[PDB]
Amino acid sequence: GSEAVMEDVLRPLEQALEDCRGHTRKQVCDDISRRLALLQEQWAGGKLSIPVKKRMALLVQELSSHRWDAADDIHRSLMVDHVTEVSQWMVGVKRLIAEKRSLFSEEAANEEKSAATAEKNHTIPGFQQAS
Numbered sequence: 001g002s003e004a005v006m007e008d009v010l011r012p013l014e015q016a017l018e019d020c021r022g023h024t025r026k027q028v029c030d031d032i033s034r035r036l037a038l039l040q041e042q043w044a045g046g047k048l049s050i051p052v053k054k055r056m057a058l059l060v061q062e063l064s065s066h067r068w069d070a071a072d073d074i075h076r077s078l079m080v081d082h083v084t085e086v087s088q089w090m091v092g093v094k095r096l097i098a099e100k101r102s103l104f105s106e107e108a109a110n111e112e113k114s115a116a117t118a119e120k121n122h123t124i125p126g127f128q129q130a131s
Helices: 006-020 028-044 049-061 068-081 091-105
Strands: none
Touching: 006 028, 006 049, 006 091, 028 091, 049 068, 068 091
């Protein structure tokens, strides 16, 4: 629109970071949470320019889904128009995107498996009875 309000932007943002904060072994907490609080005060007291809040609000729309590749688009858009205005906190935002890629590789298919995810054979017979 013409202006997004901090509240509606912040709630999905925190929850998105908190999906990553599950693994705090990737630095993700201190980095992104720091920039999270920096973002909110730049929005309020920093009095960020209108187009920046607008385009970032679009991120919030895609942020509710696994549209990490789409979240990159607004970064490309901001970098050309208003790069220096957002050059501080955008590092953690783009970092969130990069780290979330690895979460797709985390399979939770270990719920009582008797034959792996899709059958499993053993070349080791235990004892050399018939070999």
